[PDB]
């Protein structure tokens, strides 16, 4: 090796020894270092074995022949030079390793081999170099090399084709080149360019990325962690995601090395402008190194993104499973908002970290490399500069710690907000009926303001950290130079170091974010590890032995939580098989607690409970999913028409199906809001009955149905002559009409078994229950999320800009422009201006500091803008959602509304401001580069348009697909939330019916759809990026080829920078365009039709408007949607002032539709209501709802303080609230509570019994107490003693106000002056109850089934 023949001569020729040693050691060596490592992948990852094909054999045979040929050389050498022995033998054995490797790759099922192809490429290049040398030299050993080269070339061509396999994702069958360049998606790219992409065009998820192949692994690792240990979530994380992620370390290291090597080649090339061969070889080397850098970096990015997506899938699945197995105490502790945050944006924090977590070691690697270069270029003086960086470590770290705390608080606040929103979604009908939309809007606004203040402080600290990190290189430069002068600096020596500082700045300009991502991910890990470590109920607590007493209990002390006192005190009873059991009692005595204790939903302090046989449970509050009635009754069961029809007919559900539009196939709504209370209860009971279980725990299944339907159901389903006659049945009921039929009656008083026996046994004991008995007192309703088809409207960008404000936007743009101008001036000053040294070295520092402050400036200007816009975008949304009518919440499932408030809002909060910042930075960088290359060589400006033009085209070609993918991702994420909500609403039902596995599979399917939408998005980013970077690399080599041909310079180092800036301007613009989809989806609800104006100023009623309360319907036809039949066809009532009127009728007749129409919840289809000579159709919405009270059918208590539930407006004094609780017969219960009125109600009020929730509704009705009271079955799930107490207080407090009472208990309506009988939506018997009884009509019959005659 000497420079005369290798570099100095115009003939590019290697030396003979170099040819025979290094050029042969390179490829053989590559396979030797990779071979061992490759067994790891070949072993850990398997896909079967490929069959015997001609291609595989062709490759194997050529591997055998190639080895022979190489050993044939050793034979001829055996037949002086030392290299003529070792080299042929080494090549032969590495060749024997190559053929063995394709053999084992066949065995392990790999169609395209990256190793073989790259290995053959390197061998080919080495052979090409020797080939050219051997053909320039000119039989004996040359012909062996020609044979070797031809065989190697054919082997390389063969290695490109993909072998046979052992809406599929093309990556599973793509060739090696296709996957290294992400070509397997280009088909969807052009498709997505001709028509908007839909979910149908999207490919099915890869097997490795599928939820049921990812979540289980994480669950198993977590279970092992808990078995061996507090359990550290981080441990299971890398024990679950490192085996695949660690290859990104190799890709990152290779990319770092080659991205450092590239600029060296650039500098040598620009120094070159020596014969033309040197320039051609240098440009080819730069080109191939750049292309390899892009490919390797981009595989690294794909690995990080796929690992992050798998992390999100695993986190969502684990959260779902834990929520399924969670205990009630932990479920109360970890609110629904917290679970929604964990599964919605907590894995987003992990997703981002994935990309930066491969930099935590890369940034200090380049930092220490530049530091060593500084040491060798300037001596030990640089250690002083190190000190500065050292003193920059704690402060930032300290701030990071502070930021962490903020994030924690921020996250906590977010949970609260989401939890509150969930309550608003669940009790929206009650919220609007009570005119409480404004109060809860203000509550959510206060929570959001607190959360945004915390986020603003966190953004301030992040801006300070970014500022100090951006000013650190310049301060280090100045400190090092000042220490160095006190031997002398050389103008060249001084400035060969300034560039090193510009290189070191890159890392110090990402640690600002790597730190933020790590802090957010650490907070997320903490929240998720705390959730996954929550106490879980065990099925082994209840000895659920398969099918001599069906249910036996021995001294059970069940408690809802360990901290709280036990609810069940010494429970002991034994129910024989097939025995009808009624659990009677007053409000809040643990009857539903007893049933949930038999379901293992209650923590057991001590006892022995054995429940034998399958359990079928019906919750007092019926849980209904979005599936139709047939799928609700089936509940994932095989359809048997003979039994399904019998169950439907027996449960008195047939007439409701007759009056339903599509019968039993019509969609039923997210929460059963389509159905009535009685129909909901009947559907839940029929679902339990159809599932043939051995034990049926029925909790008030006939409380919300009339006497006739209740008797029909009991005789045909529950009673001794019903379908359930052979099953043990625990019937928790308050009605005592069916007690004589009961085989065993258990009285639950104070939480314990006060009395046990039959009706004839308890009527002779002469006890408390004896006194109680003596006293006798398809359609497709829901609309799924829709993805917009087209460019996002510029109105969305305007909405995000006008929310930020003119001043903030102008200041941010000015600071961006000033920062990039200062940076350009500094860099340009260094480039051209190169004693003046200290003075110029000071200018570099001065401009540099002037840059950092501006970097700080917009960092504190965009972020606060992100606080402003998120403060507006949410508020309008919070307004837009509430102002929307009840029909909107009916048709929109509670996964779109949660999506806007959880994930799209999070994207608006944090992602969009940062992405806007990086878009403005890239755009101004491109403008500055355009100015730079315009001032220099103005003749080149002719190529300024077309260059940008082509880039523009690529940008367009990409967004037309990319947006849709993002849109589809959001549209694919809305259902998942819904499922969680549903799963969170009916956890007890799912656990009791043992349908946990089916719901787990449904959640896995929904997450699989979401990732089917999300994975093509990241693959699209990679594909676009490869092409964009390749465009640049083919303008670097091209400008380089052109410049070398026209040598006798900086057009290249200008062209490369402009192409890189344009590539990262296109990528950023695509990112901003995709992120604006979040604002588009938030604004989607703005155009949705809303309710009538809340307050009509002109048509305001008098202050004392309902003073008479003379409600007068004219016809008031009611139609929920303009696709169904009327439910209030031509009713004419003339309710007088202060008239006790009772709207009684059959279940599902339209009684509560009257109440919904009185409040203008549903606009009148035909007719009007003139209350006190004032038409409500004309009155303001609040002017109507604030002057009419209602006690809703479904008692919902929003999570929070009990006093907050009684009046969220907080306009009643605590003394008055105490009085209102006293007339509700709840004073004793609230007073024995440890927290008194500040008692925290659970999510949806589950902390209280439904009787106590009805009492709370009555108490808040007493609090309002206007001249119109609507009693929508207030006495529905309360005992007879409480029932009469409620009626007596109403009879007293509501004595001079018009009251419209809908009830199935006719004994509460005989005192009413006159009643409204409803059958199917028409005015039936109409008059005084005594007159109707004389008429002997339908009211008489209803009183007959009620036992009142
Ligand atoms: N939100 C809704 N959308 C569409 N149809 C509905 C809706 N709510 C109820 N219905 C239908 O209207 C009819 C009457 O329902 P409504 O709410 O008036 O019953 P109800 O009189 O309150 O019954 P119950 O006696 O059980 O309280 C039924 O056919 C029911 O399925
Ligand atoms: N999730 C919960 N957290 C805390 N306490 C609860 C919870 N669920 C029920 N309780 C308490 O259990 C007690 C009894 O509730 P349960 O519903 O069993 O009463 P009940 O007498 O059957 O009610 P009802 O008369 O309405 O049928 C009440 O003190 C209630 O507050
Ligand atoms: Mg109950
Ligand atoms: Mg009703």
From Swiss-Prot:
Q: Name the SUPFAM superfamilies on file.
A: ABC transporter transmembrane region, P-loop containing nucleoside triphosphate hydrolases
Catalytic activity line of the entry: ATP + H2O + xenobioticSide 1 = ADP + phosphate + xenobioticSide 2; an S-substituted glutathione(in) + ATP + H2O = an S-substituted glutathione(out) + ADP + phosphate + H(+); sphing-4-enine 1-phosphate(in) + ATP + H2O = sphing-4-enine 1-phosphate(out) + ADP + phosphate + H(+); leukotriene C4(in) + ATP + H2O = leukotriene C4(out) + ADP + phosphate + H(+)
Q: Give UniProt keywords alphabetically.
A: ATP-binding, Cell membrane, Glycoprotein, Hydrolase, Lipid transport, Membrane, Nucleotide-binding, Phosphoprotein, Repeat, Translocase, Transmembrane, Transmembrane helix, Transport
Query: At which positions is ATP 1 bound?
Result: 585-592
The way its activity is modulated is described as: MK 571 inhibits sphingosine 1-phosphate and leukotriene C4 export.
Q: One Gene Ontology cellular component annotation?
A: basolateral plasma membrane
Instruction: Tell me the residue numbers annotated for binding ATP 2.
Output: 1145-1152
> Where does the ABC transporter domain lie?
551-775, 1111-1345
Q: What are the transmembrane regions?
A: 19-39, 60-79, 80-99, 112-132, 143-163, 237-257, 280-300, 357-377, 381-401, 464-484, 503-523, 802-822, 851-871, 915-935, 937-957, 1029-1048, 1049-1065
Instruction: Give the source's domain of life in one word.
Output: Eukaryota
Q: Using the record's annotation, list all stretches that form the ABC transmembrane type-1 domain.
A: 245-520, 809-1074
The EC class name is: translocase
Matching SMART domains:
AAA (SM00382)
**Entries under InterPro entries matching the protein:** AAA+_ATPase, ABC1_TM_dom, ABC1_TM_sf, ABC_transporter-like_ATP-bd, ABC_transporter-like_CS, ABC_transporter_C-like, MRP, P-loop_NTPase
Q: In Gene Ontology terms, what is a biological process of this protein?
A: positive regulation of inflammatory response
The family line of this record is: Belongs to the ABC transporter superfamily. ABCC family. Conjugate transporter (TC 3.A.1.208) subfamily.
Per the entry, what this protein does is: Mediates export of organic anions and drugs from the cytoplasm. Mediates ATP-dependent transport of glutathione and glutathione conjugates, leukotriene C4, estradiol-17-beta-o-glucuronide, methotrexate, antiviral drugs and other xenobiotics. Confers resistance to anticancer drugs by decreasing accumulation of drug in cells, and by mediating ATP- and GSH-dependent drug export. Hydrolyzes ATP with low efficiency. Catalyzes the export of sphingosine 1-phosphate from mast cells independently of their degranulation.
Q: What is this protein called?
A: Multidrug resistance-associated protein 1
Lineage of the organism: Eukaryota, Metazoa, Chordata, Craniata, Vertebrata
């Amino acid at each position: 090796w000497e420079w005369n023949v290798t570099w100095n001569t115009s003939n590019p020729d290697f030396t003979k020894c170099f040819q025979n040693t290094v050029l042969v050691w390179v490829p053989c060596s590559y396979l030797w270092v990779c071979f061992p490592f490759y067994f790891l992948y070949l072993s850990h990852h398997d896909r079967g074995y490929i069959q015997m094909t001609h291609l595989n054999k062709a490759k194997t045979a050529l591997g055998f022949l190639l080895w022979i040929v190489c050993w044939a050389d050793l034979f001829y050498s055996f037949w002086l030079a030392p290299v003529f022995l070792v080299s042929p033998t080494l090549l032969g054995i590495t060749m024997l390793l190559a053929t063995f490797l394709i053999q084992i790759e066949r065995r392990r099922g790999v169609q395209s081999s990256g190793i073989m192809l790259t290995f053959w490429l390197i061998a080919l290049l080495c052979a090409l170099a020797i080939l050219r040398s051997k053909i320039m030299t000119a039989v004996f050993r040359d012909v062996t090399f020609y044979i070797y080269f031809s065989l190697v070339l054919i082997q390389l061509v063969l290695s490109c084709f993909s072998d046979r396999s052992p809406n599929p994702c093309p990556e599973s069958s793509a060739s090696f080149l296709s996957r290294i360049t992400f070509w397997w998606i280009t088909g969807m790219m052009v498709q997505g360019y001709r028509q908007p992409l839909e979910s149908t065009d999207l490919w099915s998820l890869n097997k490795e990325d599928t939820s049921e192949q990812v979540v289980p692994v994480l669950v198993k690792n977590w279970k092992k962690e808990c078995a061996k240990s507090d359990p550290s979530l981080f441990k299971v994380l890398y024990k679950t995601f490192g085996p695949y992620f660690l290859m990104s370390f190799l890709f990152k290291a290779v990319h770092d090395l080659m991205m450092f090597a590239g600029p060296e080649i650039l500098k040598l090339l620009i120094n070159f402008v020596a014969p033309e061969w040197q320039g051609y070889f240098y440009t080819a080397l730069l080109f191939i190194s750049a292309c390899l850098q892009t490919l390797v970096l981009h595989q690294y990015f794909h690995i990080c993104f796929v690992s992050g997506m798998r992390i999100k899938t695993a986190v969502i699945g684990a959260v779902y499973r834990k929520a399924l197995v969670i205990t009630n105490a932990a479920r109360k502790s970890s609110t629904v908002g917290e679970i929604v945050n964990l599964m919605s944006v907590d894995a987003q924090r992990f997703m981002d970290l994935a990309t930066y977590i491969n930099m935590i070691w890369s940034a200090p690697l380049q930092v220490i490399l530049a530091l060593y270069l500084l040491w060798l270029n300037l001596g030990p003086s640089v250690l002083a500069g190190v000190a500065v960086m050292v003193l920059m470590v704690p402060l930032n770290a300290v701030m990071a710690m502070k930021t962490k705390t903020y994030q924690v608080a921020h996250m906590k606040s977010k949970d609260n907000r989401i939890k509150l929103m969930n309550e608003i979604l669940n009790g929206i009908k009650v919220l609007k009926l009570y005119a409480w939309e404004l109060a809860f809007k203000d509550k959510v606004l206060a929570i959001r303001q607190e959360e945004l203040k915390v986020l603003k402080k966190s953004a301030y600290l992040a801006a300070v950290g970014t500022f100090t990190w951006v000013c650190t290189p310049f301060l280090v430069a100045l400190s090092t130079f000042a220490v160095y002068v006190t031997n002398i600096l050389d103008a060249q020596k001084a400035f060969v170091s300034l560039a090193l500082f510009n290189i070191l700045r890159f890392p110090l300009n990402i640690l600002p974010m790597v730190i933020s991502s790590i802090v957010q991910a650490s907070v997320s890990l903490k929240r998720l590890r705390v959730f996954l470590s929550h106490e879980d109920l065990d099925p082994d607590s209840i000895q659920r032995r398969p099918i001599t007493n069906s249910i036996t209990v021995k001294n059970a002390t069940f408690t809802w939580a360990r901290n709280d006192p036990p609810t069940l005190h010494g429970i002991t009873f034994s129910v024989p098989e097939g025995s009808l059991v009624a659990v009677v009692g007053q409000v809040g005595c643990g009857k539903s607690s007893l049933l949930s204790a038999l379901l293992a939903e209650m923590d057991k302090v001590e006892g022995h409970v054995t429940v034998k046989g399958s359990v079928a449970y019906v919750p007092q509050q019926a849980w209904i999913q979005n599936i139709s009635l047939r799928e609700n009754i089936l509940f994932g069961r095989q359809l048997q028409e003979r039994y399904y029809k019998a169950v439907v007919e027996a449960c008195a559900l047939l007439p409701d199906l007759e009056i339903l539009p599509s019968g039993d196939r019509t969609e039923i709504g997210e929460k059963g809001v389509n159905l009535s209370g009685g129909q909901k209860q009947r559907v839940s009971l029929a679902r339990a009955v159809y599932c043939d279980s051995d034990v049926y725990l029925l909790d008030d299944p006939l409380s919300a149905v009339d006497a006739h339907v209740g008797k029909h159901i009991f005789e045909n389903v529950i009673g001794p002559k019903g379908l359930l006659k052979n099953k043990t049945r625990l019937l928790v009921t308050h009605a005592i009409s069916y007690l004589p039929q009961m085989d065993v009656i258990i009285v639950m008083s104070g939480g314990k078994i006060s009395e046990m026996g039959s009706y004839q046994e308890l009527l002779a004991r002469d006890g408390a229950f004896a006194e109680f008995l003596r006293t006798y007192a398809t359609w497709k309703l829901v609309e799924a999320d829709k993805a917009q088809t087209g460019q996002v409207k510029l109105s969305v960008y305007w909405d995000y800009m006008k929310a930020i404000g003119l001043f903030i936007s102008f200041l941010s743009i000015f600071l961006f422009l000033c920062n990039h101008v200062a940076s350009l001036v500094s860099n340009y000053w260094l480039s051209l201006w190169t004693e003046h040294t200290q003075v110029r070295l000071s200018v570099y520092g001065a401009l540099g500091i002037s840059q950092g402050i501006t970097v700080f400036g917009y960092s504190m200007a965009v972020s606060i803008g992100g606080i402003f816009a998120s403060r507006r975008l949410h508020l309008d949304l919070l307004h837009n959602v509430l102002r929307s009518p009840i029909s909107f919440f009916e048709r929109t499932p509670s996964g779109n509304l949660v999506n806007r408030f959880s994930k799209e809002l999070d994207t608006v909060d944090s992602m969009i401001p940062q992405v806007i910042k990086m878009f403005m930075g890239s755009l101004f960088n491109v403008i500055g580069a355009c100015i730079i290359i315009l001032l220099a060589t103005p003749m080149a400006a002719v190529i300024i348009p077309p260059l940008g033009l082509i880039y523009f085209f690529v940008q367009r070609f990409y967004v037309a697909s990319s947006r849709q993918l993002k849109r589809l991702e959001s549209v694919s994420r809305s259902p998942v939330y819904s499922h969680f909500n549903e799963t969170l609403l009916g956890v007890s039902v799912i656990r009791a019916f043992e349908e946990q596995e089916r719901f787990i599979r449904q959640s896995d399917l929904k997450v699989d759809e979401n990732q089917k939408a999300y994975y093509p998005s990241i693959v699209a980013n990679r594909w676009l990026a490869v092409r964009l970077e390749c465009v640049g690399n083919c303008i670097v080599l091209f400008a380089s080829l052109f410049a070398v041909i026209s040598r006798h310079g900086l057009s290249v180092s200008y062209s490369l920078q402009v192409t890189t800036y344009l590539n990262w301007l296109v990528r950023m613009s695509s990112e901003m365009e995709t992120n604006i989809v979040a604002v588009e989806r938030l604004k989607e609800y703005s155009e949705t039709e809303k309710e009538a104006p809340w307050q009509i100023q002109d048509m305001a009623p008098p202050k004392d408007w309902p003073q008479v309360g003379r409600v007068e319907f004219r016809d008031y036809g009611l139609r929920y949607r303009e696709d169904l039949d009327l439910v209030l066809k031509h009713i004419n009532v003339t309710i007088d002032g202060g008239e006790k009127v009772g709207i009684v009728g059959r279940t599902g007749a339209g009684k509560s539709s009257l109440t919904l129409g009185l409040f203008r919840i549903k606009e009148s289809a035909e007719g009007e209501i003139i209350i006190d000579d004032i038409n409500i159709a004309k009155i303001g919405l609040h002017d109507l709802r604030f002057k009419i009270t209602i006690i809703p059918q479904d008692p919902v208590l929003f999570s929070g303080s009990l006093r907050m539930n009684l009046d969220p407006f907080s306009q009643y004094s605590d003394e008055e609230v105490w009085t209102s609780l006293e007339l509700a017969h709840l004073k004793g219960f609230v007073s024995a509570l440890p927290d008194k009125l500040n008692h925290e109600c659970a999510e949806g009020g589950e902390n209280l019994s439904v009787g106590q929730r009805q009492l709370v509704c009555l108490a808040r009705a007493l609090l309002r107490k206007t001249k119109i009271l609507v009693l929508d079955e207030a006495t529905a799930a309360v005992d007879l003693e409480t029932d009469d107490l409620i009626q007596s207080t109403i009879r007293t407090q509501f004595d001079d106000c018009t009251v419209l009472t809908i009830a199935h208990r006719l004994n509460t309506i005989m005192d009413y002056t006159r009643v409204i009988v409803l059958d199917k939506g028409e005015i039936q018997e109409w008059g005084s109850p005594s007159d109707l009884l004389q008429q002997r009509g339908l009211f008489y019959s209803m009183a007959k089934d009620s036992g009142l005659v």
